[PDB]
Amino acid sequence: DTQYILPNDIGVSSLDSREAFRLLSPTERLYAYHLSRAAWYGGLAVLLQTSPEAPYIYALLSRLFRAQDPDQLRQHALAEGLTEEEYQAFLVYAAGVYSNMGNYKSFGDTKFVPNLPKEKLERVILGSEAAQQHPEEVRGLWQTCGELMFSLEPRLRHLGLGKEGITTYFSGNCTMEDAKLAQDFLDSQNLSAYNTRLFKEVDGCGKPYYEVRLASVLGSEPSLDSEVTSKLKSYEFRGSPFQVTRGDYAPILQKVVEQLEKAKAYAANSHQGQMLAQYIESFTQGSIEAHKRGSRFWIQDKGPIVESYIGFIESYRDPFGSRGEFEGFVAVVNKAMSAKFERLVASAEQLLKELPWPPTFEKDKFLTPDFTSLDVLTFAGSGIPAGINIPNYDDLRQTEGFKNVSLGNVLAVAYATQREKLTFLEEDDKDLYILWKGPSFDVQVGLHALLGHGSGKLFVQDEKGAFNFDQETVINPETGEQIQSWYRCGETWDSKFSTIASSYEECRAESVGLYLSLHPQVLEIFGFEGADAEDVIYVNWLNMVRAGLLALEFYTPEAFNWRQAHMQARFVILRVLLEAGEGLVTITPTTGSDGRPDARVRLDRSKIRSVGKPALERFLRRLQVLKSTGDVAGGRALYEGYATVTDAPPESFLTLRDTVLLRKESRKLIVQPNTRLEGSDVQLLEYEASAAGLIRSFSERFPEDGPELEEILTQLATADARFW
């Protein structure tokens, strides 16, 4: 209900993984065991990539919940003067920090604080069992992270660069200008930014010193590798001093490679063995190239029983948008739910022609992709998506291929809603929503990954004046002229578009989903025919239009900034459909039954094909054209135009935003199981779908080196404390 806090009655759901794990053989279970441990180890690094006080908070909660479980601590907290409501407010906060790996929402980039008096929480922590065993370490942690745990200062509320927000990808004094200057240095030296962080210090003179730190086990000492050690030196780029170092998250990544080497023994085949071998070299040396060679082998391993991927992958939480956050997952293939996605792959090449742009802007060769539905056993990091299109390396997607994944047992969690909280919808459309939101979601996921992220040709010029296309015959469908802009060497998608790169691509993918959901052949693949085939279409469009209005929750007017890539992408689509007008979609502010400001959303079912389809057809073409040519100047002019949030009539979005926030619902928390090793057999441990259940899953998550992982996080945070 209130911003920057988590509700006591927040939804918690346990991830269902019992049946998938039961199908695994003894060898595959040991394979999934060590990979899970590796992922959970590396997921701790997200704490260091979130906020300065995040590692201290985890360390404090970890110690605290070790000596006293949630039920034991309850007896203490209530005897100290806390009400049952206040204690639940602390459990929810603790579960939030665990589930996000930090005190900032992974979906919204907003700070959340405990919903209880700080003076009352101090009397509990300082009087706890963990405080009686190790007084110096508990009082030290609370002294350091106590203030920032509750502080809702305007500059602390959102993630971002400059003095506007908080980020640990960069130092405190860094701005957008520093981030762009760094990107040019990385492009010049042909070094990726996925596993790098930037720090800026000043000397007695005042000259800024830039330090690009690679994430690796090894440090300044010489190693066998010559790839990255040749780069570990001082530079001078455009007058600015640049130092390339490594050793970031070294003790943590050390834990990771230990579990990856153990998981190598139980590899199903030679591809998985070489795959894990390169990941080890990537995490020990700090080589993205090594990780790319490992990802290359991963794509070659088609249709495994235990699917997995690890490393610094997605770049959403980076305010500049090129640095990756650590994640990693282990999942079991589900043959039943994967059947429908395989049919879509069979006719994928056929559906690409239906896209609103000439074949000169599509990939040269159609590489047969692998689309599988998986049951997640483990997903470390800030959150859990519904679908992923990995790897993110643009070069690999154009010569090797890629993998599409649909997280099956995660979709079942999302498929749960009462018609009471289905806001901004008429009661007539409420029923149609519930009956089809489930099935129509599967359609949108498939197109978003396979035909959305999977389509696109990037024009690249070689080191010499050699293009990967025919300049003499390729004509721009919007201007009519020949191509006069392209990508160069080192320049990637995230390199040029940066701050909009993520949201731009998700919007181009979501649009493909809506555009190709009209095709009857696609609906037949999911088994939707006749009137039902029309109903899944209307809902797929109704959900999109509604989501565009609900996206105002994730926009900050004072900074004119979007905090969520997908939500911004859905607001843009809403604006495009409004641009067409003709009564296709209207947002009317009304009054709720509770006597509070509310709104309603009308979507004309008939004008979808005659007005909506041509609207997306133009928009999708303009998106792809400015993307393929790397026309960033034009791309921002287009995207940041529709992304503009104003109080202009008749929509008045800024006024609606206060209505969206007034009637918003917090995102569900998800509890993941733990795998235990009984010497001979591997068993699965499940937990309660509650705040206390989520806490217990992390208390039993690191049995061997629990207290050790706390000291490591405290160490690494204390070292870089001067940066913030």
């Binding site: 519904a386 992923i388 993110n392 999302a414 992220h453």
Partner: peptide
Amino acid sequence: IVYPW
């Protein structure tokens, strides 16, 4: 990349 729930 990613598609959320």
